[PDB]
Design a protein around this ligand. Structure first.
Ligand code: ATP
Ligand code: ATP
Ligand code: CLR
Ligand code: LJP
Ligand code: MG
Ligand code: MG
Length: 1179
């Protein structure tokens, strides 16, 4: 990491921006190098800006009665804000005095021997000094304001991330990820570039006042008559402004809902492919875009008029100003031209510098109000009493989930519970699915607050959750979790939890980079990592929320008899389980039922009791766009043609005529200048040209989004495991929102300005030849410098754009596994780990932003250097009568001002066109590519299974056969590959060989027609945000009578009726409202509905007790009558059902007929069988 070159630089280097020079010549030749990226300055790091504003915000909360975040921002930015403002004012004031000096220098060409001839050279010196001071005065202040804006945004982002870690469990149901992602995604680049525009609120009026006097000098009455039009027009723009911000708050609700559905489906696509929900998910996201794009088009139509009230305004402000003066006194051309030159600045001042400033003040204060509202929310309170005898006591506790019933006090999830726990003994928390075993642990931790009751234990606590959580990094970084490493401790934990088997099979033994959630690992490997993280942590109380769900009986007994009773057996460790073997060794038991203590005591008592290609693939998506652009061009040619014959007639005039005074001298070199100043309205796009162009460009972004979401869904599994969660979420959030909002209007201004310059040069050139030759040296200079800059700029804009993914990826896992962070107390780790993501983004963004003003300053310096050269060549070579050299040259240099503005607009288009480039990389991803399943007999031959292309083979030379309508058991040790065998049939991972069914093979049929044969219950359950009927069938094939008919057999009768809207209750936060057992029953009903003659069950019973498991065999015997069943399951009770058994080990299979034979070979596995389950197998 090289340190920032801004730190050690002369004022000249910081004034002329020479310190950014190295990376351009480095980036021009070569591809950009990671070494060449500079470390952020010490001023604008995450830590200090957090430090600074954190200190002010609590001072603000302490002092005032109703605090405001703007007051906290004021005390740390206001002086450095206003310091740049006064330079930006003087830099803008010097534009208004330019027509006074230049005006006379144009007038001095007139042969009528005026006094100007005399002063011209002094204006010549003065006007050169005038340009030099502005070029220096403006750009440092803009960079200064961008630099302050960047510091404000980093400070607020840091305060949101600290606030969200202390946020209440009550609030998490209300605020989804789409709320947080959208808030950051909106502000990320909009807030920084805004503070350049923000000052023109108070610059523009003083500018209007200063200009109105200078016009009042020329025209006494009419100038006010003109101004009235701009007051008339300014109120119309303010009307569009308030209209456009009411269309944006209707849409803002819709965007959040789209991101939560898009995130959820791509996070667990492996289920989405198994069920075959492509059309279902696409049609769902399609319906959310309908409302969004309706509001986008409406907000875009009002935005055009706001950005089209400057070009049209031009002609009418001058016309209404000169007309009244013309009728009474008469006018000289020298008076009309002067007015034109003042007018252009005034409109710039009042029609694109005033409506862009206020619009920035609304958005900034709106964004700050949402952040301030987000900071003032219900916090997770902590109340831990270190002083204790280490006796975990609970007495007379009740608890409700929601606020309403709890506050008004629906049945509470706990009531009338009480227990006493000495230090060095484990509690056996037992009961049926929906007893409140997770809820009890949530009360012990303090996530769920009890209405009536009291809890007390010491602050130190460990927590192994039911849904296992894996942060992004190495298995080591997961197991130790933000603390020092201890060789003796870490190794002893891994042998206790016995991951030694699973860790040794990996290529990189200890440390492999796991993704967001850890889908590289199976269910058993995640559970034991979560348990290892819990065990490696040291605390007074260990909470274990059923870690033996996904484990086989051999692993379950060894890990129980190796960790729970060996590694920790001198402390209070409440556990969740439902087996006799675990309750025997346990000292105290608590059997919950319907949120009530059925029993409490001991085991003995209980028995007693009972680039060109990017710019070309974006124009040829939609045919309307190419018709509209051709339609604009033919109308453009017509007005260029119309103006040419107007100026032909006007110039060729043979001229009491007070109306407009002209002489042979003045005529020739004012008539052309008048046209150049009024060529911004004549060659303007109307509501015939501008409307459809905006309409089509939004239609392009709708088509691009459809293709992108379509391509991501049907791409192969390897390409989707390669990329992160935040990388997916970044594009659909930020990159698709740029094609909807900014990019359609950014192209409009670029085309408008480009047409004005082309058409201006065209009419001037055809009528007077040498001005085209005069423009060419300045034209080539701008194109030269532009081509040079874009080589570095395009490479910085990709490192910066892809630099966003760290911030989002981190924000997902932070919010996803929030309960474990506060359990272990690892906020200081995650805050400092989050600061690195901001510093990374700042490092790239600051670099790109600073490179731009270099370009912005250099192109103005080029224009100044040429204008200085033109002015003295003009003034010095002026004849005794009628100097023609200056007449030709200054006309060109009036055009180059409009082109300078167009080149700056061109760089804003290329920066936004990067986004469309990054969308097209997702569109260009590879594709995975009588009655048929009558009986459902499978024949596998020479099968091989591996995830990565040319990696390690998980299964090797697999072959076996199932006869029709036969139930088949599948089993083996955790991490054997059982899922891989189920994924091999669906062929989600790439395989070799053939699996032929009912005498017909893979290659005979398409893949989507193939996957409709099977009926899947996956290991990881997927419940998207919607109604129960939407989850149970997205296609809406089955009736309510049908779904209610299924709902009783699998037993969601009592589950659904609990909630208000029966089959209309909108599930949230990935179905957090339902318990873990109900999610397994949800996937069962989903498979029961889909009548399939083959069906695949990946551990249907995960954390179901023996009572709930009767439903599984009830529905498996009755509903699945004739169809063949592959049952992948750990519990031995399930083996009584199915005939043939498939055992997996050593990357190969073995098939067995009877159970007696199979269990006979293996002794340790037969000795793991429960005594209650041993009397069933053997009679
Ligand atoms: N966030 C929540 N909001 C509202 N109700 C909830 C929430 N979480 C759980 N519940 C309800 O509380 C009851 C008990 O939940 P809990 O998860 O503690 O049961 P459990 O015994 O742990 O389930 P399982 O045996 O499947 O692990 C369930 O009926 C469930 O509907
Ligand atoms: N997506 C993947 N990419 C790479 N390797 C994988 C992937 N999924 C699984 N593996 C590897 O394959 C091994 C076995 O895979 P699989 O997920 O089928 O185990 P399993 O039998 O389902 O486990 P469990 O018994 O816990 O359900 C894992 O131990 C892991 O090393
Ligand atoms: C800083 C600004 C807002 C102050 C007010 C505007 C200034 C520019 C205005 C207010 C009064 C104006 C003056 C009013 C009358 C005359 C006399 C005339 O023969 C030459 C111009 C001159 C001298 C004007 C120059 C511009 C002027 C000085
Ligand atoms: C904002 C807007 C309504 C934009 C606008 C105008 S005026 C105008 N077009 C015309 O005059 C016109 C004439 C022929 N074809 N178009 C527009 C517009 N965008 O078309 C004004 C009034 C300044 O203000
Ligand atoms: Mg539970
Ligand atoms: Mg599995």
């Amino acid at each position: 990491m090289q340190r920032s070159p801004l730190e050690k630089a002369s004022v000249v280097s910081k004034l002329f921006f020479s310190w950014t020079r190295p990376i351009l010549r480095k980036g021009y030749r070569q591809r950009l190098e990671l070494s060449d990226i500079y470390q952020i300055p010490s001023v604008d790091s995450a830590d200090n800006l957090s430090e600074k504003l954190e200190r002010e915000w609590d001072r603000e909360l302490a002092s005032k009665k109703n605090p405001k975040l703007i007051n906290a921002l004021r005390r740390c930015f206001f002086w450095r804000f206003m310091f740049y403002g006064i330079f930006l004012y003087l830099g803008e004031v010097t534009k208004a005095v330019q027509p006074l000096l230049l005006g006379r220098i144009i007038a001095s060409y007139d042969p009528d021997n005026k006094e100007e001839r005399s002063i011209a050279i002094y204006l010549g010196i003065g006007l050169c000094l005038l340009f030099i001071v502005r070029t220096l005065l403006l750009h440092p202040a803009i960079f200064g304001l961008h630099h302050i804006g960047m510091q404000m945004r980093i400070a607020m982002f840091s305060l949101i991330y600290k606030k969200t870690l202390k946020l209440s469990s009550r609030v998490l149901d209300k605020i989804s990820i789409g709320q947080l992602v959208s808030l950051l995604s909106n502000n990320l680049n909009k807030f920084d570039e805004g503070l350049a525009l923000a000052h023109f609120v108070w610059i523009a009026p003083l500018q209007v006042a200063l200009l109105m006097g200078l016009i009042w000098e020329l025209l006494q009455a009419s100038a006010f008559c003109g101004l009235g039009f701009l007051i008339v027009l300014a109120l119309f723009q303010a009307g569009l402004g308030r209209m456009m911000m009411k269309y944006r708050d209707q849409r803002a609700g819709k965007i959040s809902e789209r991101l939560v559905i898009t995130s959820e489906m791509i996070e667990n696509i492996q289920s989405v492919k198994a069920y075959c929900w492509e059309e279902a998910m696409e049609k769902m996201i399609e319906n959310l875009r309908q409302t969004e794009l309706k509001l986008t088009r409406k907000a875009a139509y009002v935005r055009y008029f706001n950005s089209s009230a400057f070009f049209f305004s031009g002609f009418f402000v001058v016309f209404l100003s000169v007309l009244p003066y013309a009728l009474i006194k008469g006018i000289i051309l020298r008076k009309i031209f002067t007015t034109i030159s003042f007018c252009i600045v005034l409109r710039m001042a009042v029609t694109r510098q005033f409506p862009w400033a206020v619009q920035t003040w609304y958005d900034s204060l709106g964004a700050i109000n949402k952040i301030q509202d987000f900071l003032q929310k219900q916090e997770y309170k902590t109340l831990e009493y270190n002083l204790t005898t280490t006796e975990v006591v609970m007495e007379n506790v009740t608890a409700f989930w929601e606020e309403g019933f709890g506050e008004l006090f629906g049945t509470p999830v706990l009531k009338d519970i009480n227990f006493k726990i000495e230090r060095g003994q484990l509690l056996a928390v037992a009961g049926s699915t929906g007893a409140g075993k997770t809820s009890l642990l949530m009360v012990i931790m303090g996530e769920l607050e009890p209405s009536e009751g009291k809890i007390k234990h010491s602050g130190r606590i460990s927590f192994c959750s039911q849904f296992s959580w894996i942060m992004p990094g190495t298995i080591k970084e997961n197991i130790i979790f933000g603390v020092s490493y201890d060789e003796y401790r870490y190794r002893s934990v891994i042998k206790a939890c016995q991951l030694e088997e699973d860790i040794s099979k990996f290529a990189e033994k200890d440390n492999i980079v796991l993704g967001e959630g850890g889908i590289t690992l199976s269910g058993g490997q995640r559970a034991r990592i979560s348990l290892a993280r819990a065990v490696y942590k040291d605390a007074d109380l260990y909470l274990l929320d059923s870690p033996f769900g996904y484990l086989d009986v051999l692993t379950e007994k060894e890990i129980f008899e190796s960790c729970v009773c060996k590694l920790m057996a001198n402390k209070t460790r409440i556990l969740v389980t439902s087996k006799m073997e675990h309750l025997k060794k346990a000292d105290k038991i608590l059997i919950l039922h319907e949120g009530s203590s059925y029993f409490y005591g001991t085991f003995s008592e209980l028995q007693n009791l009972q680039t060109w290609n990017t710019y070309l693939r974006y124009i040829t998506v939609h045919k309307s766009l190419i018709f509209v652009l051709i339609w604009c061009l033919v109308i453009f040619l017509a007005e260029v043609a119309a103006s040419l014959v107007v100026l032909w007639l006007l110039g060729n005039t043979p001229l009491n005529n007070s109306y407009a005074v002209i002489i042979t001298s003045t005529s020739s070199y004012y008539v052309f200048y008048i046209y150049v100043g009024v060529a911004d309205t004549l060659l303007a796009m109307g509501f015939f040209r501008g409307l459809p162009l905006v309409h089509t460009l939004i239609t392009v972004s709708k088509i691009l989004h459809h293709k992108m979401l379509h391509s991501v869904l049907q791409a192969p599994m390897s390409t989707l495991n390669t990329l992160k969660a935040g990388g997916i979420l970044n594009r659909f959030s930020k990159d698709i929102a740029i094609l909807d909002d900014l990019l359609p209007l950014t192209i409009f201004d670029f085309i408008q300005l480009l047409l004005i310059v082309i058409g201006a040069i065209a009419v001037v050139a055809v009528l007077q030849p040498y001005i085209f030759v005069a423009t060419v040296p300045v034209i080539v200079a701008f194109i030269m410098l532009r081509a040079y800059f874009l080589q570095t700029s395009q490479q910085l804009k990709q490192l910066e754009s892809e630099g966003r993914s760290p911030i989002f990826t981190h924000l997902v896992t932070s919010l996803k596994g929030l309960w474990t962070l506060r359990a272990f107390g690892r906020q200081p780790y995650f805050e400092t780990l989050f600061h690195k993501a901001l510093n990374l983004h700042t490092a790239n963004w600051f670099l790109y932003l600073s490179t731009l003003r270099w370009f912005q300053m250099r192109i103005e310096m080029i224009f100044v250097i040429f204008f200085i050269a033109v002015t003295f060549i003009s003034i010095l070579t002026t004849g005794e009568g009628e100097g023609r050299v200056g007449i030709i040259l200054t006309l060109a240099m009036n055009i180059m001002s409009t082109l300078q503005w167009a080149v700056n607009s061109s760089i804003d288009v290329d920066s936004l066109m990067r986004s469309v480039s990054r969308v097209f990389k997702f569109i260009d991803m590879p594709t995975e590519g009588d009655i048929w399943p009558s009986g459902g007999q499978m024949t596998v031959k020479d099968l091989t299974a591996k995830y990565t292309e040319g990696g390690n083979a998980i299964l090797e030379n697999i072959s076996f056969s199932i006869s029709p309508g036969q139930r088949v058991g599948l089993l083996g040790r955790t991490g054997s590959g059982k899922s891989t065998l189920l994924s091999a049939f669906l062929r989600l991972l790439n395989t070799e060989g053939e699996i032929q069914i009912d005498g017909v093979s893979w290659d005979s049929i398409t893949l989507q027609q193939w996957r409709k044969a099977f009926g899947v219950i996956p290991q990881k359950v997927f419940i998207f945000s919607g109604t129960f009927r939407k989850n149970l069938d997205p296609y809406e094939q089955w009736s309510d009578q049908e779904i209610w008919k299924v709902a009783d057999e699998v037993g969601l009768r009592s589950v659904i009726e609990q909630f208000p809207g029966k089959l209309d209750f909108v599930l949230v936060d990935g179905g957090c409202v339902l318990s873990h057992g109900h999610k397994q029953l949800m996937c069962l009903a989903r498979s029961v509905l889909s009548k399939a003659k083959i069906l695949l069950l990946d551990q249907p019973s995960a954390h179901l007790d023996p009572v709930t498991y009767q439903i599984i065999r009830r529905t498996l015997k009755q509903a699945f009558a004739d169809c063949t069943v592959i049952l992948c399951e750990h519990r031995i009770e399930a083996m009584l059902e199915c005939q043939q058994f498939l055992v997996i080990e050593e990357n190969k299979v073995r098939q067995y007929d009877s159970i007696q034979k199979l269990l006979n070979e293996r002794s340790l596995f037969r000795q793991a069988i429960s005594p209650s389950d041993r009397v069933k197998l053997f009679p």
